[PDB]
Design an enzyme around this catalytic site. Sequence first.
Site, PDB file in Angstrom:
ATOM      1  N   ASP A  39     -74.756  22.965 -66.777  1.00 43.39           N
ATOM      2  CA  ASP A  39     -75.723  22.938 -68.035  1.00 43.39           C
ATOM      3  C   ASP A  39     -75.138  23.483 -68.928  1.00 43.39           C
ATOM      4  OD1 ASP A  39     -78.257  23.765 -69.281  1.00 43.39           O
ATOM      5  OD2 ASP A  39     -79.147  22.874 -67.310  1.00 43.39           O
ATOM      6  N   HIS A  69     -81.029  27.013 -72.136  1.00 42.79           N
ATOM      7  CA  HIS A  69     -81.385  26.224 -71.205  1.00 42.79           C
ATOM      8  C   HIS A  69     -80.802  26.621 -69.948  1.00 42.79           C
ATOM      9  CE1 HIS A  69     -81.574  22.211 -69.256  1.00 42.79           C
ATOM     10  NE2 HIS A  69     -82.559  22.120 -69.968  1.00 42.79           N
ATOM     11  N   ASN A 161     -87.636  13.335 -68.941  1.00 44.43           N
ATOM     12  CA  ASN A 161     -88.986  13.628 -69.530  1.00 44.43           C
ATOM     13  C   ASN A 161     -89.682  12.518 -70.412  1.00 44.43           C
ATOM     14  OD1 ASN A 161     -88.754  16.285 -68.391  1.00 44.43           O
ATOM     15  ND2 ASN A 161     -87.425  16.998 -70.193  1.00 44.43           N
ATOM     16  N   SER A 224     -86.332  19.343 -66.079  1.00 47.18           N
ATOM     17  CA  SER A 224     -85.256  20.181 -65.990  1.00 47.18           C
ATOM     18  C   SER A 224     -85.800  21.491 -65.268  1.00 47.18           C
ATOM     19  CB  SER A 224     -84.892  20.881 -67.600  1.00 47.18           C
ATOM     20  OG  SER A 224     -83.921  19.800 -68.092  1.00 47.18           O
TER      21      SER A 224
END
Length: 279
Positions: A39, A69, A161, A224
């Site tokens: 990530d 994130h 998404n 996520s």
Amino acid sequence: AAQTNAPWGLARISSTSPGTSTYYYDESAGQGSCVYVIDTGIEASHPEFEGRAQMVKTYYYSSRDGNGHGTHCAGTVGSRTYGVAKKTQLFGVKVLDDNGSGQYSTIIAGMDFVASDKNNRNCPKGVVASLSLGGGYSSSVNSAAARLQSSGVMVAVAAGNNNADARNYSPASEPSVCTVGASDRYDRRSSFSNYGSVLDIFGPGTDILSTWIGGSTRSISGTSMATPHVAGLAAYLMTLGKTTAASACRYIADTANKGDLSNIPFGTVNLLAYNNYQA
Ligand SMILES: [Pr+3]
Ligand SMILES: [Pr+3]
């Protein structure tokens, strides 16, 4: 063990019904397992990680999470307060820049790195990789995820998404990994969650409280956020000896809450991650 006033997502994965506030889990809590969070990096110094988090690789100038994130996702895997597997070891691989983006070539390199690096780590109960990222379909990215899974790592990836069929997104569309959709606290499919036959499982994804950079916390939404619930659940189950890296996604699907979700299109599984804890 029991965590009272838990984030709703943790409570949900230890209940057969929505609306509870306690997270029930076995004390072993993923000890002896390892989860790679691929990530933006991990703020390893966050008190919530208790020294169990470590950066092992970066593809940019620094290993720092300048975004948040990655720290958020890592927190949902294994932070003390916000994590599923509260005693797991966390390894950060920074393949996304501080804007949250990255080239496919770098994301692939990061997956190949984990497949090799795990051989130098003490992870007696097994290894998980959590990939809360993706973009348009790429056979090379899919192949890299399949390699990582084949190497003996439980690979969990976000469905995406786009409120669309995940077949057009990578690495979501790789059949051999564990592709995770998102739900909300009322057991609806999250309005942004991708769907489709390639999905394996849903996890909590809307309004998920976890760790953030600067030693803080915040609530955000996405597939996520759902992915690290499933990654942490896999680590937890592997530590308990219930399943292995090769079969964890199937085991999670087999033992899931079935038929609880609403707004699931025909052809998409109605399965919600569940730890089956019984005191
Ligand atoms: Pr139910
Ligand atoms: Pr699959």
